[PDB]
Amino acid sequence: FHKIRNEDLIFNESLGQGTFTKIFKGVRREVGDYGQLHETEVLLKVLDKAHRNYSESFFEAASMMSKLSHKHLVLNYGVCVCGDENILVQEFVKFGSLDTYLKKNKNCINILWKLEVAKQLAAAMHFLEENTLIHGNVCAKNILLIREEDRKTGNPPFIKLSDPGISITVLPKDILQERIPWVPPECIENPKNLNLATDKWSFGTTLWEICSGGDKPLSALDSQRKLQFYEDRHQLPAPKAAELANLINNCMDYEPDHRPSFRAIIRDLNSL
Numbered sequence: 296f297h298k299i300r301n302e303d304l305i306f307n308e309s310l311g312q313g314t315f316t317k318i319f320k321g322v323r324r325e326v327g328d329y330g331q332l333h334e335t336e337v338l339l340k341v342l343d344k345a346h347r348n349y350s351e352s353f354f355e356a357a358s359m360m361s362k363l364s365h366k367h368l369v370l371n372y373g374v375c376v377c378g379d380e381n382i383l384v385q386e387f388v389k390f391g392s393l394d395t396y397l398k399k400n401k402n403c404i405n406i407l408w409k410l411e412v413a414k415q416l417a418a419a420m421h422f423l424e425e426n427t428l429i430h431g432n433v434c435a436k437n438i439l440l441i442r443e444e445d446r447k448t449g450n451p452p453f454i455k456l457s458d459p460g461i462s463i464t465v466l467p468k469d470i471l472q473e474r475i476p477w478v479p480p481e482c483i484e485n486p487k488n489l490n491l492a493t494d495k496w497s498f499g500t501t502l503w504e505i506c507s508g509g510d511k512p513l514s515a516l517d518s519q520r521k522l523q524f525y526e527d528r529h530q531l532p533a534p535k536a537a538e539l540a541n542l543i544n545n546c547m548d549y550e551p552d553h554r555p556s557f558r559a560i561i562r563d564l565n566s567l
């Protein structure tokens with residue numbers, strides 16, 4: 296990663312928290328193309344100092360994805376590791392993460408918006424699958440909205456997939472259980488089962504979020520009951536707007552080997 300000096304970064308408002316992290320809007324002073332000086336809006340993602348022992352996984356999350364370049368993958372500018380900080384410096388996305396956007400905007404998101412977003416997520420995942428790169432934490436909180444839909448110019452919304460954060464292969468068991476039903480059953484059984492098929496299951500859970508106005512699937516279940524949901528082999532209820540329910544359930548297959556390729560997922564979306 297490119298190294299960015301702390302002197303060149305200004306922290307502004309908090310934008311929320313992730314697992315062992317806090318996110319802020321900020322500004323980076325930099326020399327850009329043609330030698331022009333810029334003050335660039337950035338997302339600053341800060342590893343909690345109490346959890347500095349996760350720093351390798353925290354950065355590994357950003358690194359492997361940054362090794363590929365793609366229009367639907369978030370841009371990482373660099374890292375700041377001055378002093379006692381562990382900071383990832385990422386492009387600032389104007390409309391934020393999709394979980395929040397969906398909850399705020401339930402009433403004006405229709406089936407065509409959901410389908411376009413699903414197709415774009417599936418394109419990003421097909422790119423990862425073709426490169427045999429595991430993401431490991433597909434969820435609406437890790438989808439960023441670059442551009443809102445504009446009917447008045449026929450313009451679709453445009454999303455990017457952000458980094459997965461610290462890997463489920465190193466996280467505490469109780470955090471994994473709280474992340475059911477994004478973490479697939481085989482990874483609850485053994486987090487080293489993380490595989491390309493993991494991302495197909497989580498993609499189904501993410502489609503359910505997209506279809507459910509920002510609701511969290513199984514939120515009313517505590518961790519014990521989320522575990523038993525897997526033990527009993529349940530599927531999620533169909534969203535009220537159920538156009539994608541079959542695809543969600545086909546992706547959320549308890550047999551990892553039976554989960555469909557992202558090419559087949561795309562063909563299915565294109566058929567609707």
Ligand SMILES: N#Cc1ccc(Nc2nc(N)cc(-n3ccc(CO)n3)n2)cc1
Pocket residue numbers: 310311313318338385386387388389390391392436437438439457
């Ligand atoms: N109101 C408001 C508002 C909130 C956030 C943004 N911008 C943004 N830009 C990014 N590159 C990443 C994120 N994230 C948000 C959650 C995560 C965890 O994945 N990231 N948010 C813009 C407006």
